[PDB]
Amino acid sequence: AVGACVLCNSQTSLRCGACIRRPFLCCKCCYDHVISTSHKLVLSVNPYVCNAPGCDVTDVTQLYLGGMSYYCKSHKPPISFPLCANGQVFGLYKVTDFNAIATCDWTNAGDYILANTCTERLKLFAAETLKATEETFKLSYGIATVREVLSDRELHLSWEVGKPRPPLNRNYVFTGYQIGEYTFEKDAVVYRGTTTYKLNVGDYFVLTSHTVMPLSAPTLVPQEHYVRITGLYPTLNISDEFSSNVANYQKVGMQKYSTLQGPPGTGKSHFAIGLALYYPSARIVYTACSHAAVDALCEKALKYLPIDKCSRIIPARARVECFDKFKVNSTLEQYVFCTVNALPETTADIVVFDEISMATNYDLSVVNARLRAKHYVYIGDPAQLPAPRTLLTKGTLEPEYFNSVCRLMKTIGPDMFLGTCRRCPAEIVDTVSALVYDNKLKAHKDKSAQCFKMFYKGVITHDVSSAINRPQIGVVREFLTRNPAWRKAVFISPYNSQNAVASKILGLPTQTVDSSQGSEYDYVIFTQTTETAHSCNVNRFNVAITRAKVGILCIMSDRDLYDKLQFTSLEI
Ligand SMILES: [Zn+2]
Numbered sequence: 001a002v003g004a005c006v007l008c009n010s011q012t013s014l015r016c017g018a019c020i021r022r023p024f025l026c027c028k029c030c031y032d033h034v035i036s037t038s039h040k041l042v043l044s045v046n047p048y049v050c051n052a053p054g055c056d057v058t059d060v061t062q063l064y065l066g067g068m069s070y071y072c073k074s075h076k077p078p079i080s081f082p083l084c085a086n087g088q089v090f091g092l093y094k095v096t097d098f099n100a101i102a103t104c105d106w107t108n109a110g111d112y113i114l115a116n117t118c119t120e121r122l123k124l125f126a127a128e129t130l131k132a133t134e135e136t137f138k139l140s141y142g143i144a145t146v147r148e149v150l151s152d153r154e155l156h157l158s159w160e161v162g163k164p165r166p167p168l169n170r171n172y173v174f175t176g177y178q179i180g181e182y183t184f185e186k187d188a189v190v191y192r193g194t195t196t197y198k199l200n201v202g203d204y205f206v207l208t209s210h211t212v213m214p215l216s217a218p219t220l221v222p223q224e225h226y227v228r229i230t231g232l233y234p235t236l237n238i239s240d241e242f243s244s245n246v247a248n249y250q251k252v253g254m255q256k257y258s259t260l261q262g263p264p265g266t267g268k269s270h271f272a273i274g275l276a277l278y279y280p281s282a283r284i285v286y287t288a289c290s291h292a293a294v295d296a297l298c299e300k301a302l303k304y305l306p307i308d309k310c311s312r313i314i315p316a317r318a319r320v321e322c323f324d325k326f327k328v329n330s331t332l333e334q335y336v337f338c339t340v341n342a343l344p345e346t347t348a349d350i351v352v353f354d355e356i357s358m359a360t361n362y363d364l365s366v367v368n369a370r371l372r373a374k375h376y377v378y379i380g381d382p383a384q385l386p387a388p389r390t391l392l393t394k395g396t397l398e399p400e401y402f403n404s405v406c407r408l409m410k411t412i413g414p415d416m417f418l419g420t421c422r423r424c425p426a427e428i429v430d431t432v433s434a435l436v437y438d439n440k441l442k443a444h445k446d447k448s449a450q451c452f453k454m455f456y457k458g459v460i461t462h463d464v465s466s467a468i469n470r471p472q473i474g475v476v477r478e479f480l481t482r483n484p485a486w487r488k489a490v491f492i493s494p495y496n497s498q499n500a501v502a503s504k505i506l507g508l509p510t511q512t513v514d515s516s517q518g519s520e521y522d523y524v525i526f527t528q529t530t531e532t533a534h535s536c537n538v539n540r541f542n543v544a545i546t547r548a549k550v551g552i553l554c555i556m557s558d559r560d561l562y563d564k565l566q567f568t569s570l571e572i
């Protein structure tokens, strides 16, 4: 019960019992919280509740100190002191933003704005509160039970009445019962068990509600700037491949932390791996939120770094298949590749946190708590997709509010910027450079003359809420017949249901914009499907068109984004 105030650090025994995270609040700050919010339960060794038998007064403003015990206005002794007076709550050792973080439901964008513009301790409080809210929200959904099993990849489900049904996409990883984690896709539904098991009729599923641990470390450690490269030993025989980043690698050694904004295909993973060749003695821990981001870093390290000093840390509860070419779970290796949730408690000369737009402040804090490093490097792009905020339904979350690192990149600018896109044909580079990069992204490739756009609204149907546009898939079918080189294209859309239809009608491999992030393909066929806030999101649009190395076909619903595409227009 001895603690330190979340708003002022002043020691106290007072905790708000009405806050989902029960934060320590000092006398002057506990008062400002209880008098301005619906939160009236104050905790200590003993709660501030009426000691009179059978009395239910728990409100601190309606309670008093009668000797050593607490009583309400109806039960207090003549010699008693109100717990709330002179702007203070009685306690040992004797805010507008804190109130809003403590009481909000996390369904509005303004809640996330606040959680990123507040003080550093309030950023951790917001992160802890939000994650706890997100996990209690998992209980609200209805249990799905296996009703029948057709084959090895298709089944039929029975849902719990009264309780709502969670949206069916690979974004919601279920838990089958402990018969392995399971994922679902849309009566013909597809069952995807992470662990191969004979799908039993009657076995129930439940969403993975994990316990939210407290945050101790800040999202960002305080910045230090040095006059010399500190604790890192460079080479003067740095391969000409990585010569373009020599000045930026030196900046990495002359600051506690550095931010790198890398638009698509500008060399983020080449920069990350080249940092190891530049400081060849440095123990580097490469971390990211997803297994895919960590695997993409493993793939680049396999080409440049010695395999015997690399280790891929895999959690014992192995969910999806990941990188198999490094020695598994050897924490002591010079190069450690591991997701944020699987990180061991260790130190490093450098920590590289990749795909920073996908990090939450909870992840930023966990990294600082599990890894003590001389230097931290944050690589990503605030013009790319952020982590899904399952509770956010109202308002659009801007890139400066994704996390602390993204807030810095959007406000003061990134420390390092990779300005040349080597992946995409110039049509794509020019479009996104003007859309999200203030005309600072340059094309390495020439125009491919294989970038097409078609303005075709089609017909929007819905699979619950996930959208389908069969006419847009029909336009793609007609195009494929005339453009056989496009037979090898990846179909991309902002919807799983659109992708499921396109996969059957076109036979092209399919990918949502969100799951395509970090991947590249020679040819991409994109159907916008609808003109909603989701499908018009400039960050999602940016990720969608920048997957293409050679050609892109964009079947558009929105006139604005269609007019911004610097592509050859097609008729029909
Ligand atoms: Zn305080």
Ligand SMILES: [Zn+2]
Binding pocket: 016, 017, 018, 019, 020, 033, 039, 102
């Ligand atoms: Zn509270």
Ligand SMILES: [Zn+2]
Binding pocket: 050, 051, 052, 055, 056, 057, 071, 072, 073, 074, 075
């Ligand atoms: Zn009472």
